[PDB]
Design a binder for this molecule. Structure first.
Ligand SMILES: COc1ccc(-c2cc3c(N)cccc3c(=O)[nH]2)cc1
Ligand SMILES: [Zn+2]
Length: 209
């Protein structure tokens, strides 16, 4: 039931999604090992992901969370990178898309930094890199990220040196950076219904000059 609608580069929606992608790139403590060496992206395409059933699954859960949190869904727009992006857009997020080994337990992880999610496009730690060249810093191969609508509800704050259940009385976990002053927050949900994959972004990382 999923259809993908291309956005024009002239459309304000394309431009605002591109700006979030580009402006949330940072340097990583791995020197580029997982995601590659780059300061910016070449955006090739942005598509709106449209699936009625999956949207209604998201909004149903959003109202449940809202009603448990003084009518406040605490909804964010966050990046997700995964080898399973094609399954996600067709079937929705579920337990199969969890990062079993993540620092906040087996859940589905989202980033404010697009460059954090980029580290996961080819697997955990960047896997072995792109399938064609086996290069984690490949500047040729096309990559894909999701920019997703995520319900956080009441989020458990984990101060952090950088499927399970949410902590009792909470709907998500927030990983607050406590060492790297430039890192933005990461978030974990434990129910696939608490995210909708709204934009599919196709891109290349760009080699710095
Ligand atoms: C291969 O299964 C996985 C898919 C996505 C990720 C992933 C992890 C992650 C993280 N730990 C922090 C912030 C964002 C992400 C993310 O986008 N994907 C991890 C495993
Ligand atoms: Zn490649």
């Amino acid at each position: 039931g999923t259809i993908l609608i291309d956005l024009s580069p002239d459309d304000k929606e394309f431009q605002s999604v591109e700006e979030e992608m580009q402006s949330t790139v940072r340097e990583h403590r791995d020197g580029g090992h997982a995601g590659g060496i780059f300061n910016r992206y070449n955006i090739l395409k942005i598509q709106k992901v449209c699936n009625k059933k999956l949207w209604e699954r998201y909004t149903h859960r959003r109202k449940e969370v809202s009603e448990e949190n003084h009518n406040h869904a605490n909804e964010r727009m966050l990046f997700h990178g995964s080898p399973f992006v094609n399954a996600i857009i067709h079937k929705g997020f579920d337990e199969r898309h969890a990062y079993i080994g993540g620092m906040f337990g087996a859940g589905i992880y989202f980033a404010e930094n697009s460059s954090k999610s980029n580290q996961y496009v080819y697997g955990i730690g960047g896997g072995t890199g792109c399938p064609v060249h086996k290069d984690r810093s490949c500047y040729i191969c096309h990559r894909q990220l999701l920019f997703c609508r995520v319900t956080l509800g009441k989020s458990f704050l984990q101060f952090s040196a950088m499927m399970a259940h949410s902590p009792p009385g909470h709907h998500s976990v927030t990983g607050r950076p406590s060492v790297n002053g430039l890192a933005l927050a990461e978030y974990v949900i434990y129910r696939g219904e608490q995210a909708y994959p709204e934009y599919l972004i196709t891109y290349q990382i760009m080699r710095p000059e």
